[PDB]
Structure 1
Amino acid sequence: HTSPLLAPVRQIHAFGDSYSDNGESQRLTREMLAKGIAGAQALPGEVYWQGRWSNGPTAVEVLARQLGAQLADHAVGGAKSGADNYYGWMSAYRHTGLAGQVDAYLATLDGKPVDGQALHFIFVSANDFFEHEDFAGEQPLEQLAGSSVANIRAAVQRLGEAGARRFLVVSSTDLSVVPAVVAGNRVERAQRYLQAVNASLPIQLAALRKTRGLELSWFDHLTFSRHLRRNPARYGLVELDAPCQPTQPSVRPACANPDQYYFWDEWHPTRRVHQLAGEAMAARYAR
Protein backbone atom coordinates (compact mmCIF):
# COMPACT_ATOMS: atom_id res chain seq x y z
CA HIS A 1 0.00 0.00 0.00
CA THR A 2 1.46 3.45 -1.00
CA SER A 3 2.34 6.16 1.56
CA PRO A 4 1.06 9.76 1.53
CA LEU A 5 2.65 11.91 -1.16
CA LEU A 6 5.30 14.31 0.13
CA ALA A 7 4.83 18.05 -0.12
CA PRO A 8 5.29 19.92 -3.42
CA VAL A 9 8.81 20.98 -4.38
CA ARG A 10 9.67 24.29 -6.03
CA GLN A 11 13.48 24.26 -5.68
CA ILE A 12 15.97 21.39 -5.94
CA HIS A 13 19.65 21.60 -4.98
CA ALA A 14 21.32 18.56 -6.54
CA PHE A 15 24.68 17.14 -5.45
CA GLY A 16 26.39 14.23 -7.14
CA ASP A 17 28.24 12.88 -10.15
CA SER A 18 27.74 12.22 -13.90
CA TYR A 19 24.37 10.59 -13.24
CA SER A 20 23.11 14.14 -12.28
CA ASP A 21 25.51 16.75 -13.84
CA ASN A 22 23.61 19.07 -16.24
CA GLY A 23 26.66 21.11 -17.29
CA GLU A 24 29.02 21.81 -14.35
CA SER A 25 31.86 19.49 -15.52
CA GLN A 26 31.64 21.29 -18.91
CA ARG A 27 31.66 24.78 -17.36
CA LEU A 28 34.51 23.90 -14.94
CA THR A 29 36.74 22.11 -17.48
CA ARG A 30 36.38 25.00 -19.99
CA GLU A 31 37.51 27.32 -17.15
CA MET A 32 40.44 24.99 -16.29
CA LEU A 33 41.54 24.88 -19.97
CA ALA A 34 41.26 28.71 -20.34
CA LYS A 35 43.62 29.08 -17.27
CA GLY A 36 46.02 26.33 -18.50
CA ILE A 37 45.48 24.04 -15.47
CA ALA A 38 47.78 20.96 -15.90
CA GLY A 39 46.07 17.80 -17.18
CA ALA A 40 42.70 19.53 -17.92
CA GLN A 41 40.51 17.82 -20.57
CA ALA A 42 37.25 19.13 -22.04
CA LEU A 43 34.53 17.07 -20.34
CA PRO A 44 32.28 15.32 -20.97
CA GLY A 45 33.24 15.57 -24.64
CA GLU A 46 32.01 15.46 -28.19
CA VAL A 47 29.81 12.30 -28.03
CA TYR A 48 27.64 13.77 -25.22
CA TRP A 49 24.57 16.02 -25.29
CA GLN A 50 24.77 19.63 -24.03
CA GLY A 51 27.38 18.90 -21.29
CA ARG A 52 25.37 15.94 -19.85
CA TRP A 53 27.18 12.57 -19.63
CA SER A 54 24.33 11.05 -21.72
CA ASN A 55 22.31 11.79 -24.86
CA GLY A 56 19.72 13.84 -22.93
CA PRO A 57 18.65 15.25 -19.57
CA THR A 58 19.67 13.46 -16.38
CA ALA A 59 17.18 11.96 -13.91
CA VAL A 60 17.25 14.94 -11.55
CA GLU A 61 16.43 17.29 -14.47
CA VAL A 62 13.38 15.07 -15.28
CA LEU A 63 12.44 15.02 -11.54
CA ALA A 64 12.53 18.85 -11.49
CA ARG A 65 10.36 19.08 -14.66
CA GLN A 66 7.85 16.52 -13.26
CA LEU A 67 7.56 18.43 -9.94
CA GLY A 68 7.48 21.97 -11.42
CA ALA A 69 10.69 22.85 -9.54
CA GLN A 70 13.67 25.06 -10.36
CA LEU A 71 16.95 23.09 -10.36
CA ALA A 72 20.33 24.25 -9.08
CA ASP A 73 22.49 21.29 -10.20
CA HIS A 74 25.83 21.28 -8.33
CA ALA A 75 26.75 17.73 -9.50
CA VAL A 76 30.06 17.27 -11.34
CA GLY A 77 31.00 14.31 -13.48
CA GLY A 78 33.63 12.21 -11.74
CA ALA A 79 32.63 13.40 -8.23
CA LYS A 80 33.42 11.06 -5.37
CA SER A 81 31.54 11.04 -2.06
CA GLY A 82 34.37 12.96 -0.30
CA ALA A 83 36.18 16.15 -1.33
CA ASP A 84 37.57 15.25 -4.73
CA ASN A 85 36.99 13.74 -8.17
CA TYR A 86 37.94 10.63 -10.18
CA TYR A 87 39.85 13.22 -12.27
CA GLY A 88 42.74 13.94 -9.87
CA TRP A 89 43.90 16.93 -11.96
CA MET A 90 40.78 18.88 -10.88
CA SER A 91 41.91 18.94 -7.15
CA ALA A 92 44.51 21.70 -7.69
CA TYR A 93 41.71 23.97 -9.06
CA ARG A 94 38.46 22.98 -7.23
CA HIS A 95 37.23 20.27 -4.81
CA THR A 96 34.32 18.84 -6.82
CA GLY A 97 33.39 15.76 -4.74
CA LEU A 98 30.13 15.79 -2.78
CA ALA A 99 31.87 17.35 0.26
CA GLY A 100 33.29 20.11 -1.98
CA GLN A 101 29.91 20.74 -3.62
CA VAL A 102 28.33 21.11 -0.17
CA ASP A 103 31.16 23.49 0.89
CA ALA A 104 30.71 25.65 -2.19
CA TYR A 105 26.87 25.72 -1.83
CA LEU A 106 27.15 26.83 1.86
CA ALA A 107 29.91 29.39 0.96
CA THR A 108 27.70 30.90 -1.87
CA LEU A 109 24.98 31.50 0.78
CA ASP A 110 26.31 34.39 2.98
CA GLY A 111 25.73 33.31 6.58
CA LYS A 112 22.39 33.14 4.72
CA PRO A 113 19.51 30.73 5.43
CA VAL A 114 19.12 27.39 3.59
CA ASP A 115 15.55 27.09 2.26
CA GLY A 116 13.87 24.50 4.56
CA GLN A 117 11.35 23.72 1.70
CA ALA A 118 14.02 23.04 -0.96
CA LEU A 119 14.73 19.42 -1.83
CA HIS A 120 18.42 18.53 -1.36
CA PHE A 121 19.05 15.70 -3.82
CA ILE A 122 22.16 13.55 -3.21
CA PHE A 123 23.27 10.93 -5.75
CA VAL A 124 26.90 9.81 -5.43
CA SER A 125 29.27 6.85 -4.78
CA ALA A 126 29.93 5.25 -8.20
CA ASN A 127 33.27 7.09 -8.65
CA ASP A 128 34.46 5.86 -5.22
CA PHE A 129 34.28 2.35 -6.80
CA PHE A 130 35.50 3.30 -10.29
CA GLU A 131 38.61 5.06 -8.87
CA HIS A 132 39.37 2.11 -6.57
CA GLU A 133 39.13 -0.39 -9.44
CA ASP A 134 40.89 1.71 -12.10
CA PHE A 135 43.85 2.76 -9.86
CA ALA A 136 44.28 -0.42 -7.74
CA GLY A 137 43.03 0.88 -4.39
CA GLU A 138 44.22 -1.38 -1.50
CA GLN A 139 41.13 -0.72 0.79
CA PRO A 140 38.89 -3.83 0.97
CA LEU A 141 35.57 -3.10 -0.85
CA GLU A 142 33.56 -3.40 2.41
CA GLN A 143 35.74 -0.61 3.93
CA LEU A 144 35.40 1.50 0.72
CA ALA A 145 31.59 1.08 1.00
CA GLY A 146 31.71 2.13 4.68
CA SER A 147 33.71 5.27 3.66
CA SER A 148 31.16 6.13 0.92
CA VAL A 149 28.27 5.79 3.41
CA ALA A 150 30.08 7.87 6.09
CA ASN A 151 30.73 10.60 3.50
CA ILE A 152 27.07 10.69 2.40
CA ARG A 153 25.91 10.78 6.02
CA ALA A 154 28.33 13.64 6.72
CA ALA A 155 26.96 15.67 3.80
CA VAL A 156 23.38 15.21 5.02
CA GLN A 157 24.44 16.21 8.56
CA ARG A 158 26.27 19.32 7.31
CA LEU A 159 23.37 20.41 5.06
CA GLY A 160 20.91 19.78 7.92
CA GLU A 161 23.03 21.83 10.33
CA ALA A 162 22.94 24.72 7.84
CA GLY A 163 19.12 24.55 7.60
CA ALA A 164 18.19 21.90 5.02
CA ARG A 165 15.09 19.94 6.05
CA ARG A 166 14.16 17.90 2.93
CA PHE A 167 16.38 15.36 1.17
CA LEU A 168 16.20 12.72 -1.51
CA VAL A 169 19.11 10.29 -1.18
CA VAL A 170 19.66 7.93 -4.11
CA SER A 171 21.11 4.47 -3.49
CA SER A 172 24.05 3.02 -5.35
CA THR A 173 23.05 2.23 -8.95
CA ASP A 174 23.53 -1.32 -10.24
CA LEU A 175 27.22 -0.99 -10.91
CA SER A 176 27.29 -4.76 -11.65
CA VAL A 177 25.58 -4.20 -15.08
CA VAL A 178 27.60 -1.11 -16.10
CA PRO A 179 29.25 -2.02 -19.43
CA ALA A 180 32.77 -1.00 -18.29
CA VAL A 181 32.40 -3.15 -15.14
CA VAL A 182 31.23 -6.17 -17.19
CA ALA A 183 34.09 -5.67 -19.71
CA GLY A 184 36.53 -5.43 -16.78
CA ASN A 185 35.21 -8.74 -15.37
CA ARG A 186 34.47 -6.88 -12.07
CA VAL A 187 30.75 -7.85 -11.67
CA GLU A 188 31.07 -9.66 -8.32
CA ARG A 189 33.32 -6.82 -6.91
CA ALA A 190 30.67 -4.28 -7.96
CA GLN A 191 27.93 -6.44 -6.33
CA ARG A 192 29.81 -6.65 -3.01
CA TYR A 193 30.40 -2.88 -2.98
CA LEU A 194 26.88 -1.79 -4.01
CA GLN A 195 25.17 -4.23 -1.66
CA ALA A 196 27.26 -2.96 1.28
CA VAL A 197 26.41 0.71 0.47
CA ASN A 198 22.72 -0.09 -0.05
CA ALA A 199 22.40 -2.13 3.17
CA SER A 200 24.13 0.49 5.38
CA LEU A 201 22.87 3.83 3.96
CA PRO A 202 19.19 3.30 5.01
CA ILE A 203 20.45 2.59 8.60
CA GLN A 204 22.32 5.93 8.58
CA LEU A 205 19.15 7.69 7.18
CA ALA A 206 17.14 6.31 10.17
CA ALA A 207 19.68 7.83 12.62
CA LEU A 208 19.54 11.23 10.81
CA ARG A 209 15.68 11.27 10.89
CA LYS A 210 15.91 11.48 14.76
CA THR A 211 17.05 15.09 14.44
CA ARG A 212 15.72 18.40 12.95
CA GLY A 213 12.45 16.71 11.70
CA LEU A 214 14.45 15.85 8.59
CA GLU A 215 12.48 14.41 5.67
CA LEU A 216 15.01 11.89 4.30
CA SER A 217 13.56 10.06 1.32
CA TRP A 218 15.42 7.04 -0.12
CA PHE A 219 15.30 6.16 -3.82
CA ASP A 220 16.37 2.55 -4.39
CA HIS A 221 17.87 2.78 -7.88
CA LEU A 222 18.74 -0.95 -7.81
CA THR A 223 15.03 -1.91 -7.31
CA PHE A 224 14.19 0.57 -10.13
CA SER A 225 16.75 -0.87 -12.59
CA ARG A 226 15.99 -4.51 -11.77
CA HIS A 227 12.32 -3.87 -12.55
CA LEU A 228 13.05 -2.04 -15.80
CA ARG A 229 15.60 -4.70 -16.96
CA ARG A 230 13.25 -7.59 -16.09
CA ASN A 231 10.37 -5.95 -18.06
CA PRO A 232 12.16 -4.04 -20.84
CA ALA A 233 9.54 -4.22 -23.61
CA ARG A 234 6.96 -2.58 -21.26
CA TYR A 235 9.20 0.53 -21.38
CA GLY A 236 10.32 0.26 -25.03
CA LEU A 237 13.84 -0.98 -24.32
CA VAL A 238 15.56 -3.77 -26.34
CA GLU A 239 19.33 -3.55 -25.79
CA LEU A 240 20.25 -3.69 -22.10
CA ASP A 241 24.02 -4.31 -22.22
CA ALA A 242 25.75 -2.77 -25.28
CA PRO A 243 26.47 0.97 -25.29
CA CYS A 244 24.61 2.98 -27.95
CA GLN A 245 27.76 5.18 -28.24
CA PRO A 246 30.93 3.12 -27.82
CA THR A 247 34.01 5.02 -26.62
CA GLN A 248 36.35 2.13 -25.55
CA PRO A 249 38.85 1.46 -26.89
CA SER A 250 37.78 4.15 -29.41
CA VAL A 251 34.70 6.10 -30.48
CA ARG A 252 32.39 4.35 -32.98
CA PRO A 253 29.22 5.68 -34.64
CA ALA A 254 26.16 5.77 -32.33
CA CYS A 255 23.25 3.31 -32.71
CA ALA A 256 20.24 4.44 -34.81
CA ASN A 257 17.66 3.66 -32.06
CA PRO A 258 19.01 5.17 -28.79
CA ASP A 259 15.61 5.23 -27.01
CA GLN A 260 15.69 1.40 -27.18
CA TYR A 261 19.04 1.26 -25.30
CA TYR A 262 19.72 1.23 -21.56
CA PHE A 263 23.31 2.52 -21.79
CA TRP A 264 24.63 5.51 -23.73
CA ASP A 265 28.37 4.87 -23.19
CA GLU A 266 30.22 2.30 -21.02
CA TRP A 267 29.18 3.97 -17.72
CA HIS A 268 26.06 6.09 -18.18
CA PRO A 269 22.39 5.43 -18.98
CA THR A 270 20.60 6.90 -21.94
CA ARG A 271 18.11 9.77 -21.77
CA ARG A 272 15.33 7.17 -21.85
CA VAL A 273 16.51 5.49 -18.62
CA HIS A 274 17.13 8.93 -17.01
CA GLN A 275 13.53 9.83 -17.96
CA LEU A 276 12.14 6.67 -16.38
CA ALA A 277 14.29 7.17 -13.26
CA GLY A 278 13.24 10.80 -12.82
CA GLU A 279 9.57 9.86 -13.26
CA ALA A 280 9.99 7.10 -10.62
CA MET A 281 11.67 9.59 -8.23
CA ALA A 282 8.91 12.17 -8.79
CA ALA A 283 6.11 9.65 -8.05
CA ARG A 284 6.59 10.15 -4.25
CA TYR A 285 5.82 13.93 -4.39
CA ALA A 286 2.66 15.93 -4.94
CA ARG A 287 2.67 18.45 -7.79
Structure 2
Amino acid sequence: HTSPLLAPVRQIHAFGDSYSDNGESQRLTREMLAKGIAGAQALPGEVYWQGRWSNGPTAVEVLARQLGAQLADHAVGGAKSGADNYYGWMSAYRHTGLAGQVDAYLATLDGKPVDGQALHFIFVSAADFFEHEDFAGEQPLEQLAGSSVANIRAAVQRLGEAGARRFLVVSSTDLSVVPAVVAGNRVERAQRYLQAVNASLPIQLAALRKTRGLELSWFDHLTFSRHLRRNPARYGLVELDAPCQPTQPSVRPACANPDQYYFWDEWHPTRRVHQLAGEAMAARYAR
Protein backbone atom coordinates (compact mmCIF):
# COMPACT_ATOMS: atom_id res chain seq x y z
CA HIS A 1 0.00 0.00 0.00
CA THR A 2 1.36 3.50 -0.98
CA SER A 3 1.98 6.14 1.77
CA PRO A 4 0.78 9.78 1.67
CA LEU A 5 2.38 11.95 -1.02
CA LEU A 6 5.00 14.42 0.18
CA ALA A 7 4.20 18.15 0.36
CA PRO A 8 4.44 20.32 -2.78
CA VAL A 9 7.71 21.75 -4.09
CA ARG A 10 8.15 25.33 -5.30
CA GLN A 11 11.99 25.50 -5.58
CA ILE A 12 14.56 22.87 -6.54
CA HIS A 13 18.30 23.16 -6.03
CA ALA A 14 19.84 20.40 -8.19
CA PHE A 15 23.34 18.97 -7.69
CA GLY A 16 24.84 16.36 -9.99
CA ASP A 17 26.38 15.38 -13.28
CA SER A 18 25.56 15.17 -17.04
CA TYR A 19 22.26 13.40 -16.22
CA SER A 20 21.05 16.72 -14.68
CA ASP A 21 23.16 19.62 -16.16
CA ASN A 22 20.96 22.19 -17.94
CA GLY A 23 23.81 24.39 -19.25
CA GLU A 24 26.50 24.77 -16.54
CA SER A 25 29.19 22.66 -18.31
CA GLN A 26 28.60 24.76 -21.45
CA ARG A 27 28.83 28.07 -19.58
CA LEU A 28 31.89 27.00 -17.57
CA THR A 29 33.81 25.49 -20.51
CA ARG A 30 33.18 28.70 -22.59
CA GLU A 31 34.62 30.67 -19.63
CA MET A 32 37.60 28.25 -19.40
CA LEU A 33 38.26 28.45 -23.20
CA ALA A 34 38.14 32.29 -23.01
CA LYS A 35 40.77 32.21 -20.22
CA GLY A 36 43.04 29.76 -22.13
CA ILE A 37 42.85 27.06 -19.41
CA ALA A 38 45.15 24.18 -20.46
CA GLY A 39 43.22 21.20 -21.96
CA ALA A 40 39.80 22.89 -21.99
CA GLN A 41 37.27 21.67 -24.54
CA ALA A 42 33.76 22.95 -25.40
CA LEU A 43 31.33 20.66 -23.59
CA PRO A 44 28.99 19.04 -24.21
CA GLY A 45 29.65 19.84 -27.88
CA GLU A 46 27.70 20.42 -31.09
CA VAL A 47 25.42 17.30 -31.34
CA TYR A 48 23.58 18.25 -28.09
CA TRP A 49 20.46 20.34 -27.31
CA GLN A 50 21.06 23.78 -25.71
CA GLY A 51 24.06 22.66 -23.55
CA ARG A 52 22.26 19.58 -22.16
CA TRP A 53 24.11 16.25 -22.55
CA SER A 54 21.03 14.92 -24.42
CA ASN A 55 18.59 16.00 -27.17
CA GLY A 56 16.24 17.70 -24.69
CA PRO A 57 15.63 18.60 -21.05
CA THR A 58 17.10 16.43 -18.28
CA ALA A 59 14.99 14.53 -15.77
CA VAL A 60 15.31 17.20 -13.08
CA GLU A 61 14.00 19.84 -15.54
CA VAL A 62 10.97 17.62 -16.24
CA LEU A 63 10.54 17.03 -12.43
CA ALA A 64 10.49 20.81 -11.79
CA ARG A 65 7.83 21.30 -14.55
CA GLN A 66 5.73 18.42 -13.16
CA LEU A 67 5.79 19.78 -9.58
CA GLY A 68 5.36 23.48 -10.49
CA ALA A 69 8.76 24.41 -9.09
CA GLN A 70 11.51 26.80 -10.09
CA LEU A 71 14.87 25.09 -10.75
CA ALA A 72 18.38 26.26 -9.85
CA ASP A 73 20.44 23.56 -11.56
CA HIS A 74 24.04 23.50 -10.24
CA ALA A 75 24.85 20.17 -11.95
CA VAL A 76 27.93 19.98 -14.18
CA GLY A 77 28.60 17.31 -16.75
CA GLY A 78 31.48 15.11 -15.58
CA ALA A 79 30.87 15.91 -11.88
CA LYS A 80 32.14 13.29 -9.45
CA SER A 81 30.70 12.69 -5.99
CA GLY A 82 33.63 14.51 -4.39
CA ALA A 83 35.26 17.85 -5.27
CA ASP A 84 36.29 17.43 -8.90
CA ASN A 85 35.27 16.29 -12.38
CA TYR A 86 35.96 13.49 -14.87
CA TYR A 87 37.62 16.37 -16.84
CA GLY A 88 40.65 16.82 -14.61
CA TRP A 89 41.68 20.01 -16.42
CA MET A 90 38.70 21.85 -14.79
CA SER A 91 40.23 21.50 -11.23
CA ALA A 92 42.56 24.54 -11.92
CA TYR A 93 39.55 26.89 -12.58
CA ARG A 94 36.72 25.37 -10.44
CA HIS A 95 35.84 22.37 -8.22
CA THR A 96 32.73 21.13 -10.08
CA GLY A 97 32.07 17.82 -8.30
CA LEU A 98 29.08 17.47 -5.97
CA ALA A 99 31.21 18.72 -3.02
CA GLY A 100 32.28 21.80 -5.06
CA GLN A 101 28.70 22.52 -6.14
CA VAL A 102 27.57 22.34 -2.46
CA ASP A 103 30.41 24.69 -1.42
CA ALA A 104 29.49 27.20 -4.16
CA TYR A 105 25.76 27.08 -3.33
CA LEU A 106 26.44 27.71 0.41
CA ALA A 107 29.00 30.49 -0.42
CA THR A 108 26.51 32.36 -2.73
CA LEU A 109 23.55 32.64 -0.33
CA ASP A 110 24.33 36.43 0.05
CA GLY A 111 23.49 36.63 3.82
CA LYS A 112 20.18 34.74 3.29
CA PRO A 113 19.19 31.49 4.99
CA VAL A 114 18.88 28.22 3.05
CA ASP A 115 15.23 27.82 2.00
CA GLY A 116 13.98 25.03 4.28
CA GLN A 117 11.06 24.42 1.81
CA ALA A 118 13.39 23.95 -1.20
CA LEU A 119 13.96 20.39 -2.51
CA HIS A 120 17.71 19.60 -2.65
CA PHE A 121 18.02 17.13 -5.54
CA ILE A 122 21.23 15.07 -5.71
CA PHE A 123 22.03 12.81 -8.70
CA VAL A 124 25.70 11.80 -8.98
CA SER A 125 28.19 8.87 -9.11
CA ALA A 126 28.31 7.77 -12.77
CA ALA A 127 31.43 9.95 -13.39
CA ASP A 128 33.20 8.24 -10.46
CA PHE A 129 32.86 4.94 -12.34
CA PHE A 130 33.62 6.30 -15.84
CA GLU A 131 36.77 8.09 -14.53
CA HIS A 132 37.90 4.89 -12.74
CA GLU A 133 37.44 2.73 -15.85
CA ASP A 134 38.70 5.18 -18.49
CA PHE A 135 41.91 6.16 -16.53
CA ALA A 136 42.69 2.87 -14.60
CA GLY A 137 41.87 4.03 -11.02
CA GLU A 138 43.53 1.83 -8.35
CA GLN A 139 40.64 1.48 -5.84
CA PRO A 140 38.90 -1.91 -6.12
CA LEU A 141 35.31 -1.15 -7.32
CA GLU A 142 33.95 -1.96 -3.80
CA GLN A 143 36.15 0.82 -2.31
CA LEU A 144 35.16 3.19 -5.17
CA ALA A 145 31.47 2.54 -4.35
CA GLY A 146 32.12 3.11 -0.62
CA SER A 147 33.76 6.48 -1.44
CA SER A 148 30.83 7.45 -3.72
CA VAL A 149 28.32 6.61 -0.91
CA ALA A 150 30.40 8.46 1.71
CA ASN A 151 30.69 11.51 -0.55
CA ILE A 152 26.94 11.66 -1.20
CA ARG A 153 26.10 11.19 2.49
CA ALA A 154 28.61 13.98 3.37
CA ALA A 155 26.89 16.32 0.86
CA VAL A 156 23.43 15.73 2.40
CA GLN A 157 24.95 16.21 5.88
CA ARG A 158 26.66 19.51 4.85
CA LEU A 159 23.52 20.85 3.14
CA GLY A 160 21.44 19.84 6.22
CA GLU A 161 24.04 21.49 8.52
CA ALA A 162 23.44 24.79 6.66
CA GLY A 163 19.60 24.53 6.91
CA ALA A 164 18.37 22.24 4.10
CA ARG A 165 15.47 20.02 5.21
CA ARG A 166 14.13 18.39 2.04
CA PHE A 167 16.08 16.02 -0.25
CA LEU A 168 15.54 13.77 -3.23
CA VAL A 169 18.57 11.51 -3.83
CA VAL A 170 18.77 9.49 -7.05
CA SER A 171 20.38 6.03 -7.05
CA SER A 172 23.07 4.93 -9.44
CA THR A 173 21.59 4.50 -12.90
CA ASP A 174 22.02 1.19 -14.66
CA LEU A 175 25.60 1.78 -15.84
CA SER A 176 25.68 -1.88 -17.01
CA VAL A 177 23.50 -1.10 -20.12
CA VAL A 178 25.27 2.19 -21.09
CA PRO A 179 26.52 1.70 -24.68
CA ALA A 180 30.10 2.82 -23.82
CA VAL A 181 30.20 0.21 -20.99
CA VAL A 182 28.93 -2.57 -23.29
CA ALA A 183 31.53 -1.54 -25.95
CA GLY A 184 34.25 -1.49 -23.23
CA ASN A 185 33.26 -5.04 -22.18
CA ARG A 186 32.72 -3.66 -18.62
CA VAL A 187 29.13 -4.84 -17.95
CA GLU A 188 30.04 -6.99 -14.86
CA ARG A 189 32.21 -4.19 -13.40
CA ALA A 190 29.29 -1.72 -13.80
CA GLN A 191 26.85 -4.22 -12.26
CA ARG A 192 29.16 -4.70 -9.24
CA TYR A 193 29.74 -0.96 -8.68
CA LEU A 194 26.09 0.12 -9.05
CA GLN A 195 24.84 -2.73 -6.82
CA ALA A 196 27.27 -1.72 -4.05
CA VAL A 197 26.24 1.97 -4.24
CA ASN A 198 22.53 1.17 -4.40
CA ALA A 199 22.56 -1.32 -1.46
CA SER A 200 24.58 0.99 0.88
CA LEU A 201 23.46 4.57 0.02
CA PRO A 202 19.75 4.29 1.02
CA ILE A 203 20.81 2.69 4.35
CA GLN A 204 23.16 5.63 5.06
CA LEU A 205 20.54 8.24 3.98
CA ALA A 206 17.78 6.64 6.12
CA ALA A 207 20.02 6.96 9.23
CA LEU A 208 20.86 10.63 8.38
CA ARG A 209 17.15 11.41 7.62
CA LYS A 210 16.17 10.18 11.09
CA THR A 211 19.05 11.86 12.97
CA ARG A 212 18.52 15.34 11.40
CA GLY A 213 14.68 15.21 10.94
CA LEU A 214 14.97 15.45 7.16
CA GLU A 215 12.38 14.75 4.46
CA LEU A 216 14.49 12.57 2.19
CA SER A 217 13.16 10.59 -0.75
CA TRP A 218 15.22 7.94 -2.52
CA PHE A 219 14.57 7.43 -6.26
CA ASP A 220 15.53 3.97 -7.55
CA HIS A 221 16.59 4.74 -11.14
CA LEU A 222 17.64 1.07 -11.62
CA THR A 223 14.10 -0.25 -10.90
CA PHE A 224 12.72 2.56 -13.18
CA SER A 225 15.02 1.65 -16.13
CA ARG A 226 14.56 -2.12 -15.69
CA HIS A 227 10.76 -1.59 -16.01
CA LEU A 228 11.13 0.63 -19.15
CA ARG A 229 13.61 -1.77 -20.81
CA ARG A 230 11.51 -4.90 -20.05
CA ASN A 231 8.29 -3.23 -21.53
CA PRO A 232 9.66 -0.77 -24.17
CA ALA A 233 6.60 -0.84 -26.50
CA ARG A 234 4.35 0.34 -23.59
CA TYR A 235 6.46 3.57 -23.59
CA GLY A 236 6.87 3.94 -27.37
CA LEU A 237 10.54 2.82 -27.23
CA VAL A 238 12.00 0.69 -30.05
CA GLU A 239 15.82 0.87 -29.81
CA LEU A 240 17.31 0.20 -26.37
CA ASP A 241 21.01 -0.22 -27.20
CA ALA A 242 22.15 1.82 -30.21
CA PRO A 243 22.81 5.52 -29.64
CA CYS A 244 20.54 7.78 -31.72
CA GLN A 245 23.54 10.16 -32.09
CA PRO A 246 26.81 8.14 -32.39
CA THR A 247 29.99 10.01 -31.30
CA GLN A 248 32.56 7.10 -30.93
CA PRO A 249 34.87 6.67 -32.65
CA SER A 250 33.41 9.65 -34.59
CA VAL A 251 30.23 11.73 -34.97
CA ARG A 252 27.69 10.23 -37.45
CA PRO A 253 24.22 11.51 -38.43
CA ALA A 254 21.45 11.24 -35.80
CA CYS A 255 18.59 8.69 -36.07
CA ALA A 256 15.25 10.05 -37.52
CA ASN A 257 13.01 8.81 -34.62
CA PRO A 258 14.83 9.92 -31.38
CA ASP A 259 11.71 9.56 -29.16
CA GLN A 260 11.84 5.80 -29.92
CA TYR A 261 15.50 5.56 -28.66
CA TYR A 262 16.70 5.00 -25.08
CA PHE A 263 20.21 6.45 -25.57
CA TRP A 264 21.17 9.73 -27.22
CA ASP A 265 24.97 9.13 -27.26
CA GLU A 266 27.07 6.32 -25.76
CA TRP A 267 26.52 7.51 -22.11
CA HIS A 268 23.33 9.58 -21.89
CA PRO A 269 19.62 8.92 -22.29
CA THR A 270 17.37 10.70 -24.76
CA ARG A 271 14.91 13.46 -23.87
CA ARG A 272 12.18 10.75 -23.99
CA VAL A 273 13.82 8.74 -21.21
CA HIS A 274 14.62 11.93 -19.24
CA GLN A 275 10.86 12.77 -19.50
CA LEU A 276 9.79 9.35 -18.22
CA ALA A 277 12.43 9.61 -15.42
CA GLY A 278 11.30 13.05 -14.34
CA GLU A 279 7.65 11.94 -14.35
CA ALA A 280 8.65 8.94 -12.21
CA MET A 281 10.63 11.18 -9.81
CA ALA A 282 7.60 13.45 -9.39
CA ALA A 283 5.40 10.47 -8.27
CA ARG A 284 6.23 10.85 -4.52
CA TYR A 285 5.09 14.57 -4.42
CA ALA A 286 1.77 16.40 -4.53
CA ARG A 287 1.54 19.10 -7.22
Counterpart CA distance in 1 for 2:269 and 2:210 is 35
CA offset digits 1:197-226 (Å, max 9, x no partner) = 000001101110122310110000000000
Q: Tell me which residue corresponds to 1:86.
A: 86
Deviation of 1:64 (Å): 0.1
Query: Could you tell me how far 1:56 is from its partner in structure 2?
Result: 0.1
Name the structure 1 match of 2:240. Answer: 240
**Separation in 2, partners of 1:20, 1:221:** 13
Instruction: Report deviation, 1:112.
Output: 2.7
The equivalent of 1:159 in structure 2 is 159
Measure, in 2, the Cα distance between the counterparts of 1:142 and 1:213: 30
1:133-163 deviation digits (Å, cap 9, x = unpaired): 0000111000000000000000000000000
- Give the 3-state SS of the residue equivalent to 1:209 in structure 2: helix
Deviations for 1:240-261, whole angstroms, at most 9, x for unmatched residues?
A: 0000000000000000000000
- Per-residue CA distance 1:30-66 (angstroms, 9 max, x = gap): 0001111111101000000000000000000000000
Give the Å deviation of 1:82.
0.1
Q: Structure 2, unaligned stretches of length 5 or more?
A: none
1:156-179: CA deviations, max 9, x gaps?
000000000000000000000000
Q: Counterpart of 1:86 in 2: which secondary structure? A: coil
Secondary structure at the aligned position of 1:91 is classed as: helix
What per-residue deviation string (whole Å, max 9, x for no partner) do you get for residues 230-278 of structure 1? 0000000000000000000000000000000000000000000000000
Report the CA distance between 1:283 and its aligned residue.
Answer: 1.0
Q: Distance in 2 between matches of 1:254 and 1:209?
A: 44
Shifted more, 200-209 versus 187-196: the winner is: 200-209
Match of 1:77 in 2: 77
Secondary structure, aligned partner of 1:210: helix
Judge which range, 172-181 or 33-42, deviates more.
33-42
CA drift of 1:110 comes to 3.2
TM-fit CA distance, 1:88:
0.3
Q: Please tell me the root mean square deviation across aligned C-alpha atoms, in Å.
A: 0.6
Per-residue Cα deviation, 1:88-140 (whole angstroms, up to 9, x for no partner): 00000000000000000000013431001000000000000000000001110
SS at match of 2:205: helix
Unmatched 5+ residue regions in structure 1? none
State the TM-score, normalizing by the size of structure 1.
0.99
| Aligned equivalents of 2:274, 2:45: Cα separation in 1 | 19
Q: Secondary structure at the match of 1:277?
A: helix
The percent identity for this pair of structures is 100
How many residue pairs get aligned? The number is: 287
Aligned to 2:266, the other structure's residue is in SS state: coil
**Matching residue of 1:8:** 8
Worse-superposed segment, 205-214 or 16-25? 205-214
SS for the counterpart of 1:38 is coil
SS at match of 2:20: coil
Q: Normalised by the size of structure 2, how large is the TM-score?
A: 0.99
Q: Supply the distance in 2 between the matched residues of 1:281 and 1:137 (Cα, whole angstroms).
A: 32
